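ERR on first pass: missing label on line 2. Operator R.T. fixed the label and resubmitted. Corrected input:
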Amino acid sequence: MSLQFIGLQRRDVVALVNFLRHLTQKPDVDLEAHPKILKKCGEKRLHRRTVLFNELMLWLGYYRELRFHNPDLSSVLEEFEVRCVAVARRGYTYPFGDRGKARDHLAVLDRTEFDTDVRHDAEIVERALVSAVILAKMSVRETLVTAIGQTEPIAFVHLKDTEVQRIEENLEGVRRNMFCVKPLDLNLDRHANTALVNAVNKLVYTGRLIMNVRRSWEELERKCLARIQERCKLLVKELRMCLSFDSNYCRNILKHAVENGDSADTLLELLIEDFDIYVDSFPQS
Amino acid sequence: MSLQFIGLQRRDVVALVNFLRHLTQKPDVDLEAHPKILKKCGEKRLHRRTVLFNELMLWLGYYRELRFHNPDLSSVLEEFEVRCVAVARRGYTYPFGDRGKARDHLAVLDRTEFDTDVRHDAEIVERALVSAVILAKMSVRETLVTAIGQTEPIAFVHLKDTEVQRIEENLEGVRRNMFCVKPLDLNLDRHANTALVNAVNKLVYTGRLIMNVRRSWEELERKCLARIQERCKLLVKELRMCLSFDSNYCRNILKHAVENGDSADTLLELLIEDFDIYVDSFPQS
Amino acid sequence: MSLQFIGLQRRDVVALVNFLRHLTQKPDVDLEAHPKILKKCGEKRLHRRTVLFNELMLWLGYYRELRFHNPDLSSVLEEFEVRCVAVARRGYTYPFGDRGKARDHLAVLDRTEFDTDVRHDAEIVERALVSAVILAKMSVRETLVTAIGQTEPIAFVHLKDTEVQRIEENLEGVRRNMFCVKPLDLNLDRHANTALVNAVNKLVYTGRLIMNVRRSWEELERKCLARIQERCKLLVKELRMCLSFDSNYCRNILKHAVENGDSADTLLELLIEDFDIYVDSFPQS
RNA sequence: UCCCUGGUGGUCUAGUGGUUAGGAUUCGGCGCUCUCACCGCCGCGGCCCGGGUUCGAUUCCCGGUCAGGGAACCA
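pass 2 clean. output:
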């Protein structure tokens, strides 16, 4: 439906709705990143119960938008598979000091594939990148870290400081707004470096992209669910004070547990559809 | 260049000219769906000759507009192929009762590519959809059509009835206005369904969209050509009724049969170019 | 900007500094080609010593601009190396009448590398091109120069006359203004001569582009050095006419030899810095 | 090489620190007329993008944008 707020003026309702409609465009797509939108809720200007209801509705709409856009990186996954295979071939051609030890990493790179679950996908990419970078480091005769518990740093190899700085800025930017992805003019491939190194660096860039998108989204969803649950519990603590028909009705709506954004959809739709019945409880303005 | 209408007042003429451009952005893009525009032609008010001439002009302009817009779906089938590869990617590791059947379907799914011909595109979509629905149904251990000559019906799996109604209505709207497609408010993803089931639902939706656009265009072109061909025969009889220079000239223009889209364009251009020479024939007001 | 002119008006100094600022944008990047600037530098109207000093300043500025805007053919150099590797790849496979001769020339093609120095680049490209052209001549059974103290000329083999004309015009243009390198021409046909011949032809084009750029730049530098030396000598005579402290200071500044553009920058800074103490010797207005 | 303007529905466009952003406008439907030209009727319908200023701004500052004006070699 359309979000229903208790005490907000039209000026604030339109702003809260415009922040949601345009959530993709804004950099730093995080509700907390914008304290002004939370201020539009009526905190310190409205009754506490109305403020809690407003924040619950806001977080529900925000979580709904988040799940709706929900970037599916089908083509990035396609590219990661290709680049993983390319790293494997360039490695198998290359001659190593200990072909056995490089064989473990070439095998880990061959057995890599995407599972049915997506979170597994983020973990898969990370574990593959570790081996790929280890291989590239061995190729240049650099000494990889062998301290136990200091597995490995995923990093580009034989790239000038400027390029690494630009690429890190790009990946951080994707971290802030996952929904919008920008192509890179700067090219990781360099004529000086070995072809194995160039393949490794391209695979590393794509894997960092996948990992950042997936992890950032999962964290946003976790935070949204936690905020929603806090708001539900506190609002119920408040509504339990008055035993009116409509107050009991609002609590009865809120009884549902809000885990599993499927529950979020059901809760939001139940809130909106029966709004006229329980709205008299909250004190407007 | 502009269409020429014998009897009408400049007002109605401006109305028809506005209609032709508005066609691109309108629900129900079909001339016969709008009785008012056709009646505005001058039916039963003017002489039958003039009504026939005006209707022929309107149908020629309408066909010109449809053929000119004529949506191109190259992006959409390119997206369909990626949707297939994503379905396959989620399908591979899932444990199946008969890996032989699952692997055959995953292979049919991967090798899917679109031909340059459009009709081949419709057949491709149908085959890929049958294969993907079979894979998803097997994933959930539901029974399938074992009969000979029978094939599984294309349907969404593990979706609420209300969501199915919503998407059915949306695809109906796409059928009404093939040029403009409205993004659906709903998202096909569900937390209960696995990644494979969600991928299959999205693939089903995009394939349904493709075939709907294709069939709608086919029917529209068929009706346009039939209506034009009827108007020409009727008008030729009416003109044969009267022997004059302008009447004979218009009949001579109407001799060559328009059974094509280019034949219609030639007819429209020739019938416009000589409007002044033969106009006097048709009685006005 | 830093350039100091004795007797010029504000507008003419602005014109000279603007001409140097916009140097690369103008076609025919050569001062001698642009007469209006050189005449405006000083003039017949101004005194001889003043004219000589003004020409010294203009030439020093022009040399500084040339040396700052020298070309950095990093990408073209990498491309030449890639095409050399390609010619070597297709040389070993091709069946030859006497493979020993081919193997000598292939060995020569295989060592080719670019040192840090830009001056070495033309010498490297020439050796590589001679070897490749001999290889292509052997492949097609052409007669190759065998005379004592004679070398094969670098030319395209089995190319159309029109394509040769187009490329020769492009290379003449590059000779005109080198800072602009736009090598966009790859018109070879696979059904044409053969893989070896085509690879050799592309290599020839890139080598010609590099050699032309380098030679044109070096010629400009040589002319600048000649002009600067002549200005210094004539001015030193004119100043030797008078034995003032100021004239002695101006002479002592002009002792520095302007070969080795580093010396040119030394002279430019020395003139600009201490202008106050010796400007009195120069008559102005 | 310089500065100077502007973006407000479906074009065109007034406003112009808290306003449910308003105009003709087409559109659609009321067709009440030979056709509606009367629209006599509504209704849908819109904040250049992002950040930043206070209690709160499309409406103020800073960047980016796209369209423009006139200023640089030629001008």
